[PDB]
Design a protein around this nucleic acid. Structure first.
Ligand SMILES: [Zn+2]
Ligand SMILES: [Zn+2]
Ligand SMILES: [Zn+2]
Ligand SMILES: [Zn+2]
Lengths: 199, 565, 198, 274, 199, 159
RNA sequence: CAGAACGAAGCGCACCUAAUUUCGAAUCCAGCAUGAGAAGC
């Protein structure tokens, strides 16, 4: 429209964070150093997928509130188009008004990424039945993203900040049931014009 | 066309750029130690090469690959698997040395990691078809994983030899494997047995009470001095004391199938080589008095873990310092070897261990080619040795282009079948034929069935069957021993070569002594320990028998289970 | 007469995806990947660039109140009396700016990596779908040239504003998910048209 | 070289720093190798590359083993089927290549192999296409590809019930209502010259083909929601655009009922070429 | 004259190339599958019209240099006869000395011609509003031509080579504003004798 | 001369009856057999095995096929992309087309899912798998017919 | 003929999934201009 809503999100990990590497070339090269490599950019910065955690958080909570939201996590689902998670995060004919950017670390993989030993202990002989290594973003790193809503509606900062508390309680990334991914978002918002670059 | 980028002294960089019209193929991207900015400008001159090939894992041939990854001039890095695993020690050690010597680092650790991101591996005698060429690797008897690259291009067949080994290598095969076809251009590298005497003088020193410090290179040399101290029935312990060399010793044992035929198919060094892991245990030996053999590795005595042992050996008179390899200039090893410094310990030298071949072995290498090569580009070595070997190669009636200075070979494709009766269907002058493609030297002939009627008229791995292999892969796929990740990885290693597949299944099936765990996937269902081991051995034998079968047959057997690999 | 020659250099600050348009390349790749990148036959990566600049200036100039048409709605005829129809084109009178395809400075095997993407069920937190797609790495350099034939004054300014808009929103596809965030650098010059004549 | 008899070379010397030497032999040096047409014997102290040697025994091997820089290939000539073969076997034993004497042939097939009777060979049944400059050797999947091409073009050439007298129940509105509607739908850009031309083209191929064309331009796709009419030029609302598209459908369908002369005389006042 | 300049041009596409079909039967028997066919020979190669690109290049360039070149691009323009473009490419009275061939490809339309899918994307829905298909010639495809000047003047290679840089920076045919038709030219000139077949 | 081609799919152009053909004129002993693309594939396999040697579909009626295809195109199990890929693999051969439909219909033992597009509309799991099995049976029964009839069936659902 | 640095030990591996879907249209243009003679037999 004649405005856009910019939400500048700032994540500070409070527990170790893991999001797995998605690149076949980067997974297969780090198969003899770590068995669980983290997701990293080619500029050595850690890349977490944000759009998908916000959508799932809002879909879970809005289903539990009694609203008309659909589920896009069931296999090969068709976004209906008349949800508020179908206007924000997109349908199959209309794109998402909210452009959610990846959470990219302010530091590099040599200051936040550490390689760790995880174990599987036998419940009778109390001994290390399995040993494996993984990478994990430390407890205190800082990630930054930016959500650009293209047609600002009223319930868009109130709906993103409601999915953010759900991600602060549940977690972002992987291994979330064993304690990984506990984060704390800080949000600064602003309403910009669409013609701020035209001079 | 071949370019020789720094092929005179190998310092300031080294490279062999074969420029096919569809492909810039690079071989031996290396540096010889003795500068950085000339190395950069040499890499800039190189241009975008589709592939850098590395014969061995010395920095002489593989020391400049991460710099080409930095400048993004290289797109694939093909080497042997042992060369990959050894270069993942050499490159990290080079960067460690570069930072610790406070000389602007030639590349970074990121560059090394990206180099192994674009690193494909293929073994010996496995032809890869890339960019209108055919690249086959052949063992050359140097350090482990070293090969003699055979690029077959339409302009000709080029055999880059690299460093050919000598007869005194006890862990590789002596006769260096060669292309069985027509080599047109031989890029040979010129050169630069009192082994048992080692035993004698070590038996001299231990019985006299002292120890023996044995300088060694970490790539190949320590692991052969260790084999010589292993087969000889000695009485005193031998102790390897080098983090990089103990790692390389473990890599030699891991890559056993890529070694001599006697040693492949029990510790290779027959244990008795008690390994010093922590540096506290190295200071213990430095302060010790038990007469023992120290096969350590600082190299040519310059920097490393010898440098602590060296002072204690130096002050002692009843010990010795057996130098083994070539001591170089501006290096401690020469100065203690030439007597610049006063040693109290005996300074012996055994010229037997020399990973580089001599003149006669290179002559035998040129002679055992099926067709005498049109040209022998001698490249590296001293100038004087190159003049001598060039004169003797001329005496054997072979052309020599020494690297200070042209028949148009063109493999043609003759048709040899009738082309009069053609038809047009979809605006294509087409004709159906049923015939035979024959691959002759300098000539690929398509030849009709009549040719085959005359041609015909004139004329270790276990062995299961197709049915038993199919049945056992099905059973071990339904109790979840053979998964789809396992079948895909087995297919990848089998594409990398049959000995790579043998190494993969041996690495999975190996029960670790301490834990008692094999890396197969445990069997789903009710089975006892003896039954579980009898299923794991079935997995071992069923997948080992598959390695004997041909590539397409393995693909057809392993596409009903993992339908993507 | 003169001509403007805006050389643009683009460094990807995020993973980038532009889908392959060629059907044969898409079919050949779609036995391995589920989402191939738009790749040249010289193994370089080709992003479309005219539509992004035109859409950027259309969305921007519609917010400043300036009379710009829409060439993005279905089968819309361009007007011919707008700045976007001058710099990018109309039905009669071609666009003065020849915008080149953003060709990478590096090859497919150095900047393009296969990636694994998922679809996680919202109540069992388990992967329901998996799809492999190719993506351009962070750091890849793409060079294009913009050749304005009859140069006016505001053409460079509006092209730079469109480049800032693409710097915010993105180039290519999957833009809602964080893909395509890129940085643009501009070096413009006013060359003579008769500069090839000796 | 061309082994016509009498040989040839490329100048077309029929047998360039040439020099003669007693054959008790011509040494044709070229930049592409220094040839040596030995002739008959019953030698240059320099670089030989190709030795065209006439075989007609041990004396030939002696001759070969006195040339500095042993030759790359030795074309054997002037002998019978057995003589040039036995000399060839002896020369292969001395590690020297023998050779016993247009459009490029580009093979586009696989590389599986065998080691059959010391003749590395592979069985291939395929096709040989002859492009102007080349004769490609390609496999049967290429033939399947061009077969799918010709089938998926040949089935798009007779649409059936075309140019044929048959049959309807088409609507009705007067010649003056058809004229008025086509005028309005030509001013707003819904009915265009290309649309009217293609409607006439599919009308000549029967009434049924024109009905299929018009129901193909009026089909609102259930996924996108876009009829294939050209959108109107103006400021109409969505319901009005729907009504204009419906008027276009009804007008063209009603014009299908009228005879061909009337359809022509209505539709050359809006598009002169058909 | 006694001499004839023969310029042998070799062109390599650096971008996708589209030059659309002119033959109405072939266009109407290929717009059943692809909405934008490329112009092809009946020997299944690809034609590109070259003369008019050379004339347009030298006309735009030499009207900017300040020479007396006429415009033959405006509708039903009479070529004057007294400029260099009229000497080289033709007037109404005289014919042009430069006999420009077409740019016929070296390869056929199954190794060079691919079918692409282009879109039209709505600006407030960020989704496709139109889809069309197009035929195009791949990058690195080689086309060949031969300009043949019959009465060779001196500035007749330096004009045809100065136009060939203009058809490197602008484009040769088709959608040149989207990015298509970016090529590279390589010239191997030769001045043969006219009687070179008589001898 | 002998026609080994089914003379069906005969249209009506002008006052003539036509069928668009693409085939092989084999000649042997003045029989001059106008065969099809299916004889030649067999004869090609005969020569391919000769060179390389010396070194039950369910019958559903046409109306049932059309009805099931119409329902499965409206619940969005048979999509246009699915019909196009089935046409490509039918062009590659009957065995490849059975292999493709078996690949799509295969319930993976680990995930419990099949490569069909899910039914649009509210159903139960048993109804959904019944519709999947109907898709399997209808397309497998389509493999039984000839190329021209499969083309005429599928062109009214994906042009 | 090249890399080389207050204790122990073990271990650092598996598995699944890598599909599905929409659209593939629309519009403009189709002109002009010159020349119709000159010889021979
Ligand atoms: Zn929805
Ligand atoms: Zn070496
Ligand atoms: Zn406009
Ligand atoms: Zn003029």
């Amino acid at each position: 429209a004649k405005t856009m809503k910019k939400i500048y999100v700032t994540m500070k990990t409070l527990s170790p964070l893991y999001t797995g590497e998605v690149r076949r070339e980067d997974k297969e090269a780090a198969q003899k150093r770590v068995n669980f490599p983290v997701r990293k950019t080619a500029t050595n910065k850690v890349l977490i997928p944000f759009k998908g955690a916000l959508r799932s958080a809002l879909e879970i909570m809005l289903k539990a509130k009694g609203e008309n939201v659909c589920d896009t996590g069931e296999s090969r689902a068709r976004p209906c188009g008349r949800c508020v998670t179908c206007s924000l995060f997109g349908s199959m004919g209309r794109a998402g008004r909210a452009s959610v950017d990846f959470l990219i670390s302010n530091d590099t993989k040599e200051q936040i990424v550490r390689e760790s030993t995880h174990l599987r202990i036998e419940r009778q002989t109390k001994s290390a039945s399995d040993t494996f290594k993984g990478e994990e973003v430390i407890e205190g790193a800082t990630f930054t993203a930016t959500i650009t809503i293209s047609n600002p509606q009223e319930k868009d900062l109130s709906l993103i900040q409601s999915a953010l508390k759900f991600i602060e309680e549940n977690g972002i990334g992987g291994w979330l049931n064993k304690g990984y991914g506990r984060v704390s978002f800080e949000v600064k918002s602003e309403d910009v014009a669409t013609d701020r670059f035209l001079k | 066309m071949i370019k020789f980028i720094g092929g005179a002294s190998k310092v300031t960089g080294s490279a062999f750029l074969l420029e096919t019209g569809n492909a810039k193929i690079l071989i031996d991207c290396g540096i010889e130690q003795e500068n950085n900015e000339i190395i950069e400008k040499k890499i800039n001159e190189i241009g975008k090469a589709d592939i850098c090939i590395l014969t061995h894992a010395h920095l002489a041939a593989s020391g400049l690959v991460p710099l080409l990854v930095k400048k993004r001039k290289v797109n694939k890095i093909i080497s042997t698997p042992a060369t990959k695993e050894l270069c993942r020690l050499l490159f990290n050690d080079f960067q460690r040395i570069q930072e610790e010597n406070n000389d602007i680092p030639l590349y970074s650790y990121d560059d090394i990691e990206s180099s192994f991101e674009i690193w494909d591996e293929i073994d010996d005698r496995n032809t890869i078809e890339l960019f209108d060429t055919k690249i086959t690797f052949y063992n050359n008897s140097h350090i482990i994983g070293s090969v003699s690259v055979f690029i077959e291009t339409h302009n000709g067949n080029y055999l880059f030899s690299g460093d050919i080994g000598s007869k005194l290598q006890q862990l590789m095969d002596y006769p260096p494997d060669m292309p069985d076809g027509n080599v047109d251009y031989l890029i040979l590298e010129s050169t630069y047995s009192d082994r048992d005497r080692l035993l004698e003088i070590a038996k001299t020193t231990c019985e006299n009470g002292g120890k023996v410090l044995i300088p060694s290179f970490a790539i190949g040399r320590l692991q052969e001095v260790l084999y010589t101290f292993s087969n000889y029935n000695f009485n005193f312990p031998v102790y390897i004391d080098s983090p990089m060399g103990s790692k390389v010793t473990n890599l030699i044992k891991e890559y056993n199938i890529y070694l001599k035929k006697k040693l492949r198919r029990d510790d290779l060094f027959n244990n008795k080589y008690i390994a010093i892991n922590t540096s506290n245990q190295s200071k213990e030996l430095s302060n010790s008095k038990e007469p023992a053999v120290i096969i350590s590795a600082s190299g040519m005595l310059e920097g490393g873990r010898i440098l602590n042992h060296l002072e204690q050996i130096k002050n002692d008179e009843n010990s010795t310092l057996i130098f083994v390899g070539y001591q170089a200039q501006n290096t401690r090893g020469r100065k203690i070897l030439d007597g610049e410094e006063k040693v109290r310990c005996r300074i012996e030298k055994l010229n037997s261990f020399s990973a580089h071949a001599d003149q006669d072995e290179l002559i035998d290498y040129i002679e055992r080619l099926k067709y005498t090569p049109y040209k022998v580009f001698l490249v590296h070595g001293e100038k004087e040795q190159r003049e001598i070997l060039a004169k003797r190669i001329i005496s054997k009636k072979i052309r020599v282009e020494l690297p200070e200075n042209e028949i148009l070979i063109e493999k043609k494709v003759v048709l040899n079948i009738n082309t009069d009766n053609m038809c047009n269907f979809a605006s294509y002058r087409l004709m159906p034929f049923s015939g035979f493609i024959v691959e002759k030297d300098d000539r690929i002939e398509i030849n009709d069935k009549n040719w085959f009627d005359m041609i015909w008229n004139e004329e270790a791995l276990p062995d299961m069957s197709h049915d038993k292999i199919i049945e056992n892969i099905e059973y071990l796929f339904n109790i979840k021993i053979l998964s789809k990740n396992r079948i895909k990885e087995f297919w990848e290693e089998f594409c990398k070569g049959q000995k790579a597949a043998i190494k993969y299944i041996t690495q999975v099936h190996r029960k670790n002594p301490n834990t008692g765990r094999r890396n197969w996937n445990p069997p789903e269902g009710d089975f006892t320990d003896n039954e579980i081991e009898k299923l794991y051995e079935t997995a071992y034998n069923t997948l080992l028998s598959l390695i004997k079968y041909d590539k397409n047959k393995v693909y057809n057997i392993l596409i009903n289970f993992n339908p993507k690999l």
